[PDB]
Design a protein around this ligand. Structure first.
Ligand SMILES: [Zn+2]
Ligand SMILES: [Zn+2]
Lengths: 329, 328
């Protein structure tokens, strides 16, 4: 037989919509135990504000996991630094947020949890707390000591991975080196196989310049670097199509035959993806020893505690992580 | 009110332009279709395609008449050499340029209400020894336009670009306050005068991801884009601040805007094309007159085949007609 799996969930910024969404997630049944790494009173209070029921059971590593039943959550306690008011940032709680991220990450690394699903966090308040922080991705990449991770955004079957992420537009070109493409594609191909269960992944690659450089008249990176690397990889047996113009690549004739698209940078790949799934969009981090998914939106402070939060993205992030667990177990 | 005339240039004679125009002709139109080309070229390409075609002479002294199915109105310009579909003939470069000049002058003089252009081949024109820096450039110069802004639109979305075909590494330094002021002024101006929108609402993309996230991801938004937009909003222009490109393309935004200004090519066209694709139409903003254009090349390998696909030519023409209707 199999064992009930546990997934760890970090609601994120206490004053944002993360806690609201996690209380909303809890209103249905799940085939895994949902271990929520947060402050008990925070969830209890927020649930009351939303008029939703919630009973918390303690994370108990020395007992078998049990599927999470509606109206409940399993809690791995982490104390808040200061009292919370929905919508208002409290600098000291920045340490609390990171503490939950660290504990959740470690549990995934120690094998306590089969996946990690993150709610939104406010980077500002974390830095104000004196903790350098540029996002979950960099945080997990570093704490997990992974050589490199790749960010991916996905809806149903349409998946876009990024060669570069949150960098100024002007720093992108010089970052596209043979070393980067080799690592990024290796990780993408690897995880599509190990985490997505795709035996022979087919990757669609964007050029860096409009028209993919149009034969060198619009940039030389495709001819100088991208093409040589892709062919080096195709000789290794990888199935790659491209580089292709970004404004041409997102078509059925190309997408129907690809398991993922690799964009050279953030705004080249995400706009199409987002305009294809308001909610439903899921941020996935590839290259880590464990499965990590996440909502694809912000903390929406102005909505915290008011009852009008869209749980669509968190639900899909959770569903996806659960489905990926099998491919690894 | 009164029937308007639009002028159409099929373009490179050996290309698919004539093919598309002959197909365009197979239906009725609410405007008179004045095609600036060689009569023989059109009748021959018609025969090759098995489509019927009757040409009536452009008669400026008579009232314009809506174009009837199976016909086109002709503004004659003679080929310099015989045409073979699919083969470029340098001598006909002079013919191509003459049709562009005549059509352009007609739009500047009030003879025609809009110009819809078929595909042209720059290489053959240049190889004939003819100074010519490009299709839209030709019109920009002949019309004495100071600056043009390229836009791609369908019916539910209009995307203008601050920069077009530049290597990605050249974009950042190209986004200057002067370029931005210029581009937005034209965009705001034309949404008024060419699309007939009284109080245009424009969504503006940041240059950097997350619109630079308070300077944590680039400084262009704080150093350049935000100041320019602030200045223009002070002029009543409805500009929705630099928004992250990956959140901007959404109803709470789009349904509230008449156009989106993207900073560069791959930031705005992928979504436009995904939301439409063949539905796309290129509109040149900044000229003294309305000009729309097909979105494909001369496709010489398809010329005279029968698999043309006048689809995009129809969308470009329909779009120009609507613009004429909403501005008269
Ligand atoms: Zn991002
Ligand atoms: Zn282009």
């Amino acid at each position: 037989m199999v064992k009930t799996q546990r997934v760890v969930i970090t609601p994120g910024e206490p004053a944002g919509i993360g806690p609201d969404l996690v209380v909303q997630l809890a209103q249905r049944e799940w085939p895994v135990e949902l271990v929520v790494c947060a402050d008990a009173t925070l969830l209890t209070n927020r649930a009351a504000m939303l008029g939703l029921p919630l009973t918390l059971r303690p994370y108990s590593p020395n007992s078998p996991a049990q599927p999470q039943t509606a109206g409940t959550l399993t809690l791995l306690p982490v104390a808040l630094r200061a009292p919370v008011t929905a919508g208002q940032l409290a600098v000291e709680n920045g340490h609390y947020v990171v503490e939950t991220l660290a504990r959740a990450c470690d549990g995934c690394l120690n094998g306590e949890f089969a996946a990690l699903i993150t709610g939104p966090v406010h980077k500002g308040v974390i830095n104000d707390a004196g903790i350098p922080f540029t996002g979950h991705t960099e945080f997990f990449e570093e704490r997990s000591q992974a050589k490199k991770v790749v960010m991916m955004l996905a809806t149903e079957e349409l998946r876009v991975a990024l060669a570069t992420t949150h960098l100024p537009l002007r720093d992108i070109a010089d970052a596209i080196t043979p070393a980067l493409l080799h690592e990024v594609i290796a990780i993408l191909h690897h995880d599509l196989r190990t985490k997505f269960g795709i035996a022979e992944p087919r990757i669609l690659v964007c050029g860096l310049n409009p028209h993919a450089g149009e034969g060198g008249h619009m940039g030389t990176e495709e001819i100088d670097t991208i093409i040589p690397v892709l062919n080096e990889l195709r000789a290794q047996g990888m199935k790659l199509n491209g580089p292709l113009p970004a404004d041409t690549l997102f078509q059925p004739k190309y997408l129907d035959n690809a398991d993922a698209v690799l964009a050279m940078y953030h705004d080249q790949g995400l706009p199409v993806l987002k305009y294809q799934g308001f909610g439903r969009g899921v941020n996935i981090t590839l290259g880590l020893p464990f499965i990590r998914t996440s909502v694809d939106h912000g903390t929406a402070l102005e909505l915290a505690g008011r009852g009008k939060a869209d749980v669509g993205s968190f639900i899909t992030a959770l569903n996806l992580a659960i489905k990926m667990i099998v491919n690894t177990q």
